[PDB]
Amino acid sequence: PQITLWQRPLVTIKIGGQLKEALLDTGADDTVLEEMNLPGRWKPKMIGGIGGFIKVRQYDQILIEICGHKAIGTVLVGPTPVNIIGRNLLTQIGCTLNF
Amino acid sequence: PQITLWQRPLVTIKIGGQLKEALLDTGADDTVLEEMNLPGRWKPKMIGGIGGFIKVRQYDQILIEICGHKAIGTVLVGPTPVNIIGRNLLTQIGCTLNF
Numbered sequence: 001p002q003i004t005l006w007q008r009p010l011v012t013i014k015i016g017g018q019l020k021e022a023l024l025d026t027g028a029d030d031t032v033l034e035e036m037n038l039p040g041r042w043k044p045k046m047i048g049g050i051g052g053f054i055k056v057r058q059y060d061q062i063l064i065e066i067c068g069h070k071a072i073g074t075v076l077v078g079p080t081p082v083n084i085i086g087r088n089l090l091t092q093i094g095c096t097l098n099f
Numbered sequence: 100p101q102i103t104l105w106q107r108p109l110v111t112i113k114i115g116g117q118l119k120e121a122l123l124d125t126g127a128d129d130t131v132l133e134e135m136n137l138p139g140r141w142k143p144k145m146i147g148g149i150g151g152f153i154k155v156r157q158y159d160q161i162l163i164e165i166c167g168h169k170a171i172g173t174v175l176v177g178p179t180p181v182n183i184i185g186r187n188l189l190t191q192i193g194c195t196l197n198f
Contacts, residue, residue, distance in 0.1 A: 027127060029107070048149065051153045091103070097195075097196065098196075099192050
């Protein structure tokens with residue numbers, strides 16, 4: 001698809017047997033999703049942006065569906081207002097910036 | 100330029116007489132530059148990110164040269180680690196997100 005940046009480049013993902021809307025982000029190295037039921041082994045981690053470091057939990061070998069795109073990647077769960085798709089996954093569905 | 104996400108999409112910018120390097124962020128609505136000598140009048144609005152809440156001094160109608168591309172707009176100056184280019188300017192150099 002060609003996502004023009006006039007509005008937040010929101011997009012529906014499919015994780016956990018769940019339907020969500022996430023923000024395609026070239027400025028996230030990592031995919032950080034808001035709190036939700038996920039199964040398996042997790043793992044402490046820390047990340048920060050504008051205003052402070054936040055503690056998220058690491059989860060690897062996880063499947064995710066982006067705009068009808070499948071992809072196994074590490075996802076991070078924490079208190080973020082929006083669900084963010086970072087470069088770890090955006091690289092995977094073939095996504096490139098273009099101007 | 101076609102930009103892939105294997106590496107952080109850093110680009111160069113000429114601003115306020117100086118050469119910097121900024122991150123092109125589709126998940127940022129506004130540009131927020133590292134604290135520098137900017138000439139003019141500002142108003143300090145406050146911004147929200149995954150960190151927390153940092154204070155910035157906005158500046159309206161500044162000219163910015165991005166990866167050779169000219170654009171005039173509102174810049175936010177502040178306690179940031181990396182210079183960020185939100186969509187307030189990327190709408191402008193005409194950049195889209197492909198995949």
